Amino acid sequence: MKRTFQPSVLKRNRSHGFRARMATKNGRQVLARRRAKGRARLTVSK
Amino acid sequence: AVQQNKPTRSKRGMRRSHDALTAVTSLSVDKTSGEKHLRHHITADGYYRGRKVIA
Amino acid sequence: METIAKHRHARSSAQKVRLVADLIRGKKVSQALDILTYTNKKAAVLVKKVLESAIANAEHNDGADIDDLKVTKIFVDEGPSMKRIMPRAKGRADRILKRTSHITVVVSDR
Amino acid sequence: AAKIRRDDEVIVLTGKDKGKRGKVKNVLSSGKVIVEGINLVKKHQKPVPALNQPGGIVEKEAAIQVSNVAIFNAATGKADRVGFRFEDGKKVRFFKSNSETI
RNA sequence: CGAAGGUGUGCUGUGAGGCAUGCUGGAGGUAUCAGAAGUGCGAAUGCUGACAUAAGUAACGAUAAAGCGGGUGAAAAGCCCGCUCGCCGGAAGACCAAGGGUUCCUGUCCAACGUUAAUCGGGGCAGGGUGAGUCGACCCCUAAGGCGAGGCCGAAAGGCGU
RNA sequence: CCCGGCGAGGGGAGUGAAAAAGAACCUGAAACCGUGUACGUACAAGCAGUGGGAGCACGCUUAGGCGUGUGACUGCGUACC
C-alpha cells in the first residue's frame, strides 16, 4: 500500500532549504528562533 | 477468558509437583573392552557385545 | 574441608537449571558424573563443567582425595535480565525478558 | 617562588615514614614530590614481549604531598621553615631559626 | 575506646511515642528554653522506577523438499567440497533511473544482534578498492511557472507587473 | 600456579586498615526468588482470625516453675474506601 513519505531531494531543498527561508520575512523569523534555541542543525540543507 | 483473582505460590508448586526428571537406572559393561554404555547401544570406542564394529 | 565453584551470569533460566540440579544432591562424585553424562538437557553440560572445576580445585589447593568426595551442597539463583522489544499486529509492541542464573556447587570429604 | 626545590635535603613530618631523610628527585605540578628511598610500593608488573621486558614484583617510590616534608638544617639538626628576601639585586631563601642564607 | 543510617532484643507511658543495648557501618550528631514551616498518605481508571501472575502455556512469518559420503572444528540437520532429488524461467534471469551511502573484496573473532545451533552473516575489528577530449553532470537554448532596476497601487507589513 | 574452547566464569597466592572496598566497585531497605533445620498436614467443606486447649522439639532452672517455636480438636465470626 502506497504511504505518505515519497522522497525527492530537489523538492525537499526547494521547499525547506536555507535560501527559501531567507527569501521571506517569516522564514528569517524561523531562523532567528532556531538560533536562539541553539540547534545544531538550522535547516534541511546538507 | 482470563482469571478474576491472582493465583498463589502454593498453587504454583502444587501444579509443578509432577515435573521432576528421572535418572537412568544403571549402565552396562562390555565383555571385552570394559566400557560403560547404554543398554542395547554401542560404546564410544565402537564395540557392541564384545565385537568391534566401527573403526 | 569444603570447596566451592561457581558460574555467574549463565545464559539460562533458573527454573530450567533446577530440574537438573535436583538429580545430584548428596551423591558421590563419580556417580554424579555418570548421571550427568546421560541426561539429554542443555543445563547438564553447564552443571558438569562446574562440578569438574570444583573437583580440580579440591585436588590442587586443599590436597584432597577424589575417591572420598561428595556433593555436599548445590543451588541456583536468579541473575539480571536483558530487555528486548518484539513487534506484534496493528502497531503494538511487547517486551521480552532474557533471564540468567548463577550456579554454585560445594564438594566435601565428610 | 617555591620553598621546596629539586636536589634539596628534607625530613618527613607525617605518615609511616615520619622522621626519615632523603633527597628530592623531581617536582610535580599537582603539589607532590618524589623523595629518594621514601614511600615505597610493590607493583605487580605484567610481562611484555616487546622491549624484551619480563614481569615481576617491583619496588618503587610513590609521590607524597609537599606540605608533609620540611627543609633540613644541618647546623641545628632539625626541621625548619623558609623565607624570602633581596640581598644584592636577586631573591634568596633563608632559614627562619637562625636567619642564615641557603 | 566508634556519628548518622540499617537489622534484632529488653523495658516503659492512656495514645501519637520514649529509653537502654548486641550485630552491621565508617564521620558526623546535638540537651534545655524559644523561633519558622515545601510538617505526617492506602485509595484520586493519581505520576516515575523495580518486580510478580497467567506459563515454561501460545507462537517461531507462505505446504517449492530433501538424502548420503568426505573436511574443518571443543561441538556440525543449517558452513566448505562431491554425487543424486526438487522449484522459477515475459522471472523467483540480466542492466539502469529515483532513493540509500561502504552494505563491495581479503584477513581475523563469536559477548550482544540473527525469532533455534553456529566454525557462518548485509554483525565486531583492521587493511584494500572507484583511473574518461568521445558515457553523464557542469556548459549554449528555451516551456509551465518563479524573481524582478525604474514603474502603478496599498495604515505599516506588503501586492501586481516592464 | 590451577579447571576451562590459547573462552565466559571461578579457586588459590599477593596488595591494602578493610576485597561480602575487585572496576556490574560507599552504605545496601522492601516487593519478589531459593538452600537447610523444628513442628503441622492425604475422611476433610466458607473473609483464614479471635476465646479455649492436648501433644512434640528446644533453653534456663531454687528439680518448684518458667520462657520461646509449632499447633490436632472445639464456641463465635460474610474485607477496606
UniProtKB/Swiss-Prot annotation, chain A:
Q: Which GO terms describe its cellular component?
A: cytoplasm; cytosolic large ribosomal subunit
Q: Which PROSITE patterns match?
A: RIBOSOMAL_L34
Q: Which Pfam families match?
A: Ribosomal_L34
**This protein's superkingdom?**
Bacteria
Q: Does the keyword S-adenosyl-L-methionine apply?
A: no
GO BP annotations, alphabetical order: cytoplasmic translation
Molecular function GO labels: structural constituent of ribosome
Q: Which UniProt keywords apply?
A: Ribonucleoprotein, Ribosomal protein
Which residues are the signal sequence here? none
Keyword Ribonucleoprotein belongs to the record: yes
Q: Which family does it belong to?
A: Belongs to the bacterial ribosomal protein bL34 family.
Assembly information from the UniProt record: Part of the 50S ribosomal subunit.
Q: What is this protein called?
A: Large ribosomal subunit protein bL34
From Swiss-Prot, chain B:
Q: GO biological process annotations for this chain's record?
A: cytoplasmic translation; response to radiation; response to reactive oxygen species; ribosomal large subunit assembly
Quaternary structure note = Part of the 50S ribosomal subunit. Contacts L17.
> Looking at the record, which segments are called Disordered?
1-37
Mind telling me what this protein is named?
A: Large ribosomal subunit protein bL32
Q: Does this entry carry the keyword Ribonucleoprotein?
A: yes
Keywords of the record: Ribonucleoprotein, Ribosomal protein
* Pfam families documented for this protein: Ribosomal_L32p (PF01783)
One cellular-component annotation, GO:
cytosol
Alphabetical list of InterPro entries matching this protein? Ribosomal_bL32, Ribosomal_bL32_bact, Ribosomal_zn-bd
Record-linked SUPFAM superfamilies: Zn-binding ribosomal proteins
The entry lists its GO molecular-function terms as: structural constituent of ribosome
Report the sequence similarity comment from the record: Belongs to the bacterial ribosomal protein bL32 family.
Swiss-Prot record, chain C:
Q: Does the keyword Nucleotidyltransferase apply?
A: no
Against Pfam families, the record matches this protein to: Ribosomal_L22
Coiled coil feature spans: none
Query: What are the GO BP annotations of this UniProt entry?
Result: assembly of large subunit precursor of preribosome; cytoplasmic translation; cytosolic ribosome assembly; response to antibiotic; ribosome assembly; translation
Query: What are the alphabetically sorted keywords of the record?
Result: Antibiotic resistance, Ribonucleoprotein, Ribosomal protein, RNA-binding, rRNA-binding
- Top-level taxon of origin: Bacteria
Q: Per UniProt, where does L-tryptophan bind?
A: 90
Q: What Gene Ontology cellular-component terms does the record carry? A: cytoplasm; cytosol; cytosolic large ribosomal subunit; large ribosomal subunit
* Molecular function terms from GO: large ribosomal subunit rRNA binding; structural constituent of ribosome
Q: Does the keyword Manganese apply?
A: no
User: What is the protein's known function?
Assistant: This protein binds specifically to 23S rRNA; its binding is stimulated by other ribosomal proteins, e.g. uL4, bL17, and bL20. It is important during the early stages of 50S assembly. It makes multiple contacts with different domains of the 23S rRNA in the assembled 50S subunit and ribosome.
What does the record's miscellaneous section state?
The wild-type allele (erythromycin sensitive) is dominant over the resistant allele, and is also dominant over the temperature-sensitive allele at both low and high temperatures.
Q: How does it assemble?
A: Part of the 50S ribosomal subunit. In TnaC-stalled ribosomes forms part of the binding pocket for L-Trp with the leader peptide and uL4.
The record's section on NCBIfam families has: rplV_bact (TIGR01044)
Q: Which family does it belong to?
A: Belongs to the universal ribosomal protein uL22 family.
Q: What is this protein called?
A: Large ribosomal subunit protein uL22
Q: What is the organism of origin for this protein?
A: Escherichia coli (strain K12)
Q: Which gene name belongs to this protein?
A: rplV
Curated annotation (Swiss-Prot), chain D:
* Single GO molecular function: large ribosomal subunit rRNA binding
Q: Which GO terms describe its biological process?
A: cytoplasmic translation; ribosomal large subunit assembly; translation
InterPro entries the record matches: KOW (IPR005824), Rib_uL2_dom2 (IPR014722), Ribosomal_uL24 (IPR003256), Ribosomal_uL24_CS (IPR005825), Ribosomal_uL24_KOW (IPR041988), Translation_prot_SH3-like_sf (IPR008991)
Q: What GO CC annotations are associated with the protein?
A: cytoplasm; cytosol; cytosolic large ribosomal subunit
What keywords tag this UniProt record?
A: Ribonucleoprotein, Ribosomal protein, RNA-binding, rRNA-binding
Q: Which Pfam families match?
A: KOW, ribosomal_L24
Q: List the disulfide bonds.
A: none
Keyword Signal belongs to the record: no
Function, please? One of two assembly initiator proteins, it binds directly to the 5'-end of the 23S rRNA, where it nucleates assembly of the 50S subunit. It is not thought to be involved in the functions of the mature 50S subunit in vitro. One of the proteins that surrounds the polypeptide exit tunnel on the outside of the subunit.
Q: How does it assemble?
A: Part of the 50S ribosomal subunit. Might contact the SecYEG translocation complex when it is docked with the ribosome.
Can you tell me which family this protein belongs to? Belongs to the universal ribosomal protein uL24 family.
Protein name per UniProt: Large ribosomal subunit protein uL24
Organism, by scientific name, is Escherichia coli (strain K12)
